[PDB]
Amino acid sequence: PEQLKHCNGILKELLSKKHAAYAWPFYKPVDASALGLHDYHDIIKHPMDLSTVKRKMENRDYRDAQEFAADVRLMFSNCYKYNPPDHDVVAMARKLQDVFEFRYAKMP
């Protein structure tokens, strides 16, 4: 359960201001209506975002660090799945995932 404590620090890091230039699209769930996407939920069956991870973090919904990392990676996979690789939101996702993978790897 000490490793869940480190996951909270990783989540705080992703939500911090130093990464805001490429983390802001993942703060909240994809609002398909507001963005004009007519097919997002037919392609993405399990939406995920940083605020959902924070909510499940606070409600003790992650049994271990690997369940936490599975949700963070699901959020990036949804982005890679829905968007073409040339798209800009994908480039932001890769930067933020590179931050996450670095912090998750440095975990005891």
Ligand SMILES: COC(=O)C[C@@H]1N=C(c2cccc3[nH]ccc23)c2cc(OC)ccc2-n2c(C)nnc21
């Ligand atoms: C217009 O929406 C899209 O084409 C997809 C969308 N792009 C983006 C997006 C994010 C940043 C630069 C962008 N340029 C074109 C699309 C795009 C997006 C924007 C948001 O604003 C609150 C929230 C979520 C996303 N997002 C995520 C996450 N995964 N795909 C997207």
